[PDB]
């Protein structure tokens, strides 16, 4: 009946309500070609979208519409929604209701503009905007627990206890997968593997997904890298060329735990989660320590849950029992939560309608959200 559409900054995920996993999965990209006066043969698309842009990557200027969970170009975001509904899902938006997701502490105008596009342009019967962390917690099954959500757009934390979100203890963070990908691309240039153009941005992203892992101890990993060359793995590109890097596997995702490398002057993901828990009430800290949930693609590095356990225990008192909930399906946890929320019978009375939107306007969504 209802459609769930997790508009992620990287991978735009979408499908149906009451499902195990999403059908439509693709990178939210809109590649426009090299505009030269020379002609093109047997016709082509003026602006590609999704997997088509990824396939024909070499030529196209890959521009993401969402930057840090914030929609910059709205015409680009409108084309991706259109690509999700008609091409991938093969179903009109007028029949099915549409669950959407944004990160917490976003601009207030973005929900209003997102909702305006759904009702005016797409003619949706009913829509809703949920917090990503709230859905990630709902996919995991627990009512209680903090959610250290981390995608390519935005890392953020939302502490919740017994089905009561703590909006003032929320802490949004500028560090994310895209900033890690840019950092890996820079340190690759330092060892003679220069990647400037946006076509190579996806190759270094794919290198980041495969090889990189979180260090248990950074100074120890740096010492072993200088001594031995067993850690130095090789990755072959789409092209037959193959490259080898030693230091850059553990050093790339260390930027999460040490933002000083990127030049952000912010708290690391390990202590940002701690600072979120300390901002909550003193009586409900034990359960937040016990249920330290992870979600998103930036939590898919091997050994990240072990590093979070080391750092949070180091920050917190010795008496506390720290525990990180790190499921196998944490990459697609936000969408799974939306599918379970859409499947419930209580959610049928929580939708916005066309008549309610015509009466109120875009400002009705802020009341419905939280």
């Amino acid at each position: 009946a209802a459609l769930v559409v997790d508009n992620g900054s990287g991978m735009c995920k979408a499908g149906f309500a009451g499902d195990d996993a999403p059908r439509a999965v693709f990178p939210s990209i809109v590649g426009r070609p090299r505009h030269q006066g020379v002609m093109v043969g047997m016709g082509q698309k003026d602006s590609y979208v999704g997997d088509e842009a990824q396939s024909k990557r070499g030529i196209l200027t890959l521009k993401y519409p969402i930057e840090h969970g914030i929609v910059t170009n709205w015409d680009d975001m409108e084309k991706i929604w259109h690509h999700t509904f008609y091409n991938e899902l093969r179903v009109a938006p007028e029949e099915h209701p549409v669950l959407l997701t944004e990160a917490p502490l976003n601009p207030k105008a973005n929900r209003e503009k997102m909702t305006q596009i759904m009702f005016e342009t797409f003619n949706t019967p009913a829509m809703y905007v949920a917090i990503q962390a709230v859905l990630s917690l709902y996919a995991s099954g627990r009512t209680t627990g903090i959610v250290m959500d981390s995608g390519d757009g935005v890392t953020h934390t939302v502490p919740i206890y017994e089905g009561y979100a703590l909006p003032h203890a929320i802490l949004r963070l500028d560090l994310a997968g895209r900033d890690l990908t840019d950092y890996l691309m820079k340190i690759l240039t330092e060892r003679g593997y220069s990647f400037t153009t946006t076509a190579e941005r996806e190759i270094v992203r794919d290198i980041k997904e495969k090889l990189c892992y979180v260090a248990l101890d950074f100074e120890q990993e740096m010492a072993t890298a200088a001594s031995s060359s067993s850690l130095e793995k090789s990755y072959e590109l789409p092209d037959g060329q193959v490259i080898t890097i030693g230091n850059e596997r553990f050093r790339c995702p260390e930027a999460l735990f040490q933002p000083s490398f990127l030049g952000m002057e912010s708290c690391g993901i390990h202590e940002t989660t701690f600072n979120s828990i300390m901002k909550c009430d003193v009586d409900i800290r034990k359960d937040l320590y016990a249920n330290t949930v992870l979600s998103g693609g930036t939590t898919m590095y091997p050994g990240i849950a072990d590093r979070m356990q080391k750092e949070i225990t180091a920050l917190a008192p010795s008496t506390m029992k720290i525990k990180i909930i790190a499921p196998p399906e944490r990459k697609y946890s936000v969408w799974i939560g939306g599918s379970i929320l859409a499947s419930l019978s209580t959610f049928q009375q929580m939708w916005i309608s066309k008549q309610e939107y015509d009466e109120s306007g875009p400002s009705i969504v802020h009341r419905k959200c939280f």
Binding site: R34, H35, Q36, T61, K186, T189, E190, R191, G192, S194, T196, T197, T198, L262, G263
Partner: protein, 370 residues
């Protein structure tokens, strides 16, 4: 051992050398290795079979030229060793490498492997007592006398913009492109194929550089110059035949502001200057706009600075006092700063000694530069 140190200003297009505490570099010549195309039948001919400096400039037609450096990064190391040997030899400097310390120059964000291999050459093949590698932006500010300001530069290899404020070089605010004088010469050659006057050989490529240096001007409005019909001005070759240049003279340097005509995605000179100022902190932006310094040979086009102002006025915030300063000696600005840096008493502390290199190795060179 504290003799008068040598300042070798590197560069892909041109290489310059001399001594510390001088006004202008006495020894300037283009950075390439000329090798003969034809057979040398007659006795008493040009001996050696490896031509560097004024001999290679004199005998263009015989020699197949090839540049060892590309985008501020040496490809052919044996050629650069021969050029450095020619600099030190009796044909140019008339001094030994054993006596004097060395001041080398490199572009920012280059491969570290090339910097290590550069140091290996200077320490082992030549027997240098002390070596120091430095940035181009820091040297330009030494030559002007300022501490604050952005340094936009445009040589033959690299175009980069490093913002510095009262002796504080910002590493994360650095922008870099592979669009420069060599590429501008390559597209002028491409455009002269469309005019009719085709060029192919590497000696014949230097005619295109000579046309670029002499007869090129940057239009303020490129759309207005296109709608109008050009006058088709003339130019005499070293051979004798006249060449109607036409619209290729104004469309060639447009590259630097519009790299979409390439078919390879780049920021451009005007965006890099704005982006470097934008990426720095909020309070530093207005001081960085007021102190903009130009350098390199590809800033010497007619109406370049007038266009570079107009692009800043378009992009930058309104009602801000822009000031693109530029010295009289723009090509030699980097060498003058090195000679000033070498003459200062602090220079002894900054360098890498031969003994320190033998003990530590590459790690000590990476620590001293930053």
């Amino acid at each position: 051992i504290a003799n008068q140190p040598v300042v070798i200003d590197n560069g892909s297009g041109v290489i310059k050398a001399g001594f510390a505490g001088d006004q202008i570099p006495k020894y300037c010549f283009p950075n390439y290795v000329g090798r003969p195309k034809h057979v040398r039948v007659m006795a008493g001919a040009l001996e050696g079979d490896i031509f560097i400096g004024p001999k290679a400039e004199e005998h263009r037609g015989l020699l197949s030229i090839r540049y060892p450096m590309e985008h501020g990064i040496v490809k052919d190391w044996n050629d650069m060793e021969r050029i450095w040997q020619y600099v030190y030899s009796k044909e140019q400097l008339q001094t030994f490498s054993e006596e004097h310390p060395v001041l080398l120059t490199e572009a920012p964000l280059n491969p570290r492997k090339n910097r290590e291999r550069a140091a290996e050459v200077f320490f082992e093949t030549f027997n240098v007592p002390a070596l120091f590698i430095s940035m181009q932006a820091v040297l330009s500010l030494y030559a002007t006398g300022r501490t604050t300001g952005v340094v936009l530069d445009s040589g033959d290899g690299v175009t980069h913009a490093v913002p510095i404020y009262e002796g504080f070089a910002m590493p994360h605010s650095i922008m870099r492109i592979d669009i420069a004088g060599r590429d501008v010469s390559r597209f002028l050659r491409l455009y002269l194929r469309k005019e009719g006057y085709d060029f192919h050989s590497s000696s014949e490529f230097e005619i295109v550089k000579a046309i670029k240096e002499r007869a090129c001007y940057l239009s303020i409005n490129p759309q207005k110059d296109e709608t109008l019909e050009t006058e088709k001005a003339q130019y005499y070759l070293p051979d004798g035949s006249t060449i109607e240049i036409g619209p290729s003279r104004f469309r060639a340097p447009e590259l630097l502001f519009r790299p979409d005509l390439i078919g390879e995605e780049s920021e451009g000179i005007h965006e890099v200057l704005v982006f470097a100022i934008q990426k720095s902190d909020m309070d530093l932006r207005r001081t960085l706009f007021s102190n903009i310094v130009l350098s390199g040979g590809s800033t010497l086009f007619k109406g370049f600075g007038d266009r570079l102002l107009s692009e800043v006025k378009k992009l930058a915030p309104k009602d801000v006092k822009i000031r693109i300063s530029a010295p009289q000696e723009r090509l030699y600005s980097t060498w003058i700063g090195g000679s000033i840096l070498a003459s200062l008493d602090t220079f002894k502390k900054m360098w890498v000694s031969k003994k320190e290199y033998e003990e530590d190795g590459a790690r000590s060179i990476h620590r001293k530069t930053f």
